[PDB]
């Protein structure tokens with residue numbers, strides 16, 4: 001197959017994500033023959049692990065998924081290491097030598113990718129030095145992969161963006177959003193624009209409400225430290241949920257390129273309504289988990305590292321509105337929570353009921369197109385049909401599909417995908433600045449009301465599907481959740 | 486449940502259909518509590534089997550599906566018999582006594598149904614005498630159930646209709662069409678008008694071609710006598726196929742009553758194009774089966790009772806055209822044959838491919854909604870989605886549904902249904918004169934070309950899906966059969 005000529009620099013190349021997913025993903029791209037010879041990987045961090053120590057380190061990350069050891073060694077020989085502090089301007093001149101050397105060794109003409117697997121605060125600095133100290137490639141491309149998260153509010157994200165803008169244009173930036181790399185999420189566009197019946201039905205005339213759900217049965221566990229300040233609202237909503245909602249609410253693009261897709265999504269984001277205090281209390285719900293039945297399921301306030309007066313939200317549910325002609329009056333419901341009934345990520349599109357009367361006992365109900373992302377991809381379609389009774393009557397049936405074993409084994413892990421797209425230079429599966437800015441602006445208005453404590457904090461027995469308020473939020477518009485454990 | 490007060494007269498009450506399906510169906514309506522007391526069944530034929538002999542006869546038909554024998558006896562006691570020749574005008578006065586007596590015995594105020602399970606030629610006579618000799622009920626209703634077939638051409642069907650019109654209005658007539666009583670066929674309307682996405686897509690803008698298939702793996706066997714003169718063209722096409730095509734091509738009714746449904750179907754039938762000689766040769770295909778591989782599968786011309794110079798068609802395939810705005814240019818393909826690959830009755834709706842380009846290797850294909858009627862009800866929906874590859878690419882997947890065991894056991898057998906609808910007076914599931922007249926007119930133009938031998942007779946190896954000409958007929962419009970064994 002075609003060879004990818006690139007040189008990748010991993011800032012924080014000895015960390016968890018690095019040796020647990022980054023390195024393995026890069027190995028798969030080698031196994032599939034995409035990376036052959038003209039490529040090199042330059043690890044970097046503070047430790048002065050020498051060139052022999054690094055190789056062993058990588059051999060352990062790509063350990064479990066290798067069988068021909070000779071294949072492993074030949075790959076590992078494309079790695080090099082250099083000790084380096086990201087704040088020290090001169091240290092960069094040392095890195096530049098490691099990079100300019102690896103390039104020469106494998107005749108790599110430019111094409112550099114800088115992966116930042118470091119603390120959020122260092123993002124601005126590294127960007128600044130890459131350009132000033134001359135680590136940027138004179139030929140080919142220069143791309144930056146920014147790890148999560150991108151800011152903690154609109155103000156901070158704006159700062160980050162402005163710093164990055166000094167050296168890179170927005171299209172050269174690749175913010176890593178885990179969920180946007182999931183196979184099933186990339187099917188939403190295929191189903192919609194690939195089948196005219198849905199394509200033409202994707203609007204206010206045929207849909208009654210769209211629902212998005214991010215479920216987790218696990219509690220906070222040892223993640224309490226950071227989680228207590230972020231909560232579901234920033235952990236799952238602001239990033240993952242909004243970017244999935246983006247694929248759903250987007251306009252129909254003039255073409256299927258990153259440029260046009262982004263233009264199509266931004267049209268919806270720019271129509272997203274921002275809430276004031278009253279609206280936040282009417283359209284959103286925040287809750288926190290109590291006890292289940294089992295002592296195994298302890299209340300949030302009894303978890304380790306959790307303050308006994310914490311108002312952190314472990315569950316969020318709300319109604320989004322898009323002031324666009326195609327979405328006039330169509331509610332978009334989202335929900336994310338911990339200690340819920342099950343682990344699952346899915347989209348449920350509820351179509352409007354038909355007005356055609358059969359004179360039957362049970363008249364036509366609402367059809368539903370469910371796209372299941374996690375744990376395993378599935379697509380269900382609930383339709384109206386005839387019941388098996390003597391008198392004519394309707395019922396609903398579910399047509400179903402599921403990913404095959406062959407499909408599941410060939411499915412490219414999210415990181416492998418994101419890394420591969422970046423080498424190709426395809427922002428189709430990445431959130432753009434415009435998208436992120438609006439998402440922050442939207443979430444900030446909610447957080448303002450929470451930090452000020454101007455909304456109640458609901459509670460819910462662990463293992464449930466959330467507080468009653470979740471149901472009442474939908475009941476208000478004559479709606480209800482399709483999924484319920 | 487509500488009780489059905491009726492008195493049914495079975496002309497030919499000792500025949501096959503009578504004791505093999507008619508009687509059992511009537512027993513089920515008793516088991517389900519619909520028929521309780523104010524009802525009676527008057528058998529009739531030429532044999533003078535006395536009132537005790539008849540009861541035993543019925544006890545054998547409802548034999549295998551009875552367990553509480555006391556339930557059986559109480560039912561059987563509502564039957565009476567009378568010897569009677571249908572040509573003898575005075576014999577009717579004898580029948581009138583059997584009927585007027587049974588009515589008195591169970592206080593049945595009118596509501597009479599006359600089932601004609603006699604030879605086609607007797608239909609006109611019985612109708613005539615029922616009215617003149619006064620067997621018709623003065624109160625309630627008087628309905629006639631006409632068994633298959635209704636005419637053998639337009640001329641003969643017109644004769645029959647005119648004779649029947651002398652005593653009954655068209656709405657009081659109930660022509661028995663086996664296939665129109667099948668559960669799955671009655672689902673076609675539920676799926677279409679019950680789900681706006683299909684409802685709005687049911688036209689020339691979204692569908693590329695509709696396909697209907699009636700398959701049989703069995704040969705002619707001992708049915709050769711009659712079959713050699715009728716063939717597939719009249720055996721399966723004229724009746725079964727056209728009436729299913731009626732449900733598919735129908736307009737959207739102003740309501741869901743028999744009157745409006747029929748008005749909706751007739752709009753399509755009245756737009757059906759009738760072919761001349763050239764068109765018959767371009768749009769239709771007739772074939773006859775040869776040998777398979779196994780001696781078990783003998784050529785048609787070697788079957789018992791088959792003339793060694795017979796040009797009888799054992800397979801028919803053709804393109805129907807509806808000159809209606811909603812069907813402008815949408816081909817309707819039908820096919821019926823013996824000794825084909827499998828036994829199956831199904832409808833395949835092929836939607837047009839999308840014009841949206843993904844720049845992918847495989848661009849969007851045609852979606853397909855398959856409704857499987859026989860052997861067991863199923864609904865499949867082929868849609869475009871994303872393939873599990875590194876580069877973005879589309880593929881097709883099938884969402885599936887199947888009838889459950891509970892559904893299959895509760896499914897009311899076609900005859901039970903037809904008989905039940907007639908007692909209710911619902912022509913929704915029956916073909917009306919207008920529908921039949923056009924079907925005959927359509928088929929006659931084809932037969933004229935066949936009897937004149939102005940079209941070739943194709944051949945096909947038994948077990949196949951038909952002659953190559955079947956494929957070429959669809960290839961011409963850039964189409965192909967969805968099902969293929």
Ligand SMILES: NC(=O)c1ccc[n+]([C@@H]2O[C@H](COP(=O)([O-])OP(=O)(O)OC[C@H]3O[C@@H](n4cnc5c(N)ncnc54)[C@H](O)[C@@H]3O)[C@@H](O)[C@H]2O)c1
Pocket residue numbers: 011012013014015016017018019044045046047084085086087116117118119147148149
């Ligand atoms: N918490 C979340 O929501 C979340 C979830 C998933 C992924 N992530 C990301 O996972 C990544 C975690 O990183 P990790 O697992 O690779 O490891 P890590 O935290 O252990 O440290 C990674 C590297 O940083 C280097 N380092 C530390 N300080 C340095 C400095 N002052 N100068 C130079 N190098 C320095 C260390 O030497 C090490 O090699 C982060 O980028 C985080 O954003 C975040």
Ligand SMILES: NC(=O)c1ccc[n+]([C@@H]2O[C@H](COP(=O)([O-])OP(=O)(O)OC[C@H]3O[C@@H](n4cnc5c(N)ncnc54)[C@H](O)[C@@H]3O)[C@@H](O)[C@H]2O)c1
Pocket residue numbers: 496497498499500501502503504529530531532569570571572601602603604632633634
């Ligand atoms: N061939 C097909 O395509 C087809 C398929 C399915 C059903 N059918 C129908 O099945 C039915 C078959 O009838 P059957 O199975 O009940 O039995 P059958 O042919 O044995 O005879 C039925 C009754 O007709 C009576 N009979 C005959 N001549 C009579 C006369 N001159 N006067 C009065 N009574 C007379 C006999 O006594 C008997 O009781 C037919 O109505 C046929 O149309 C046709």
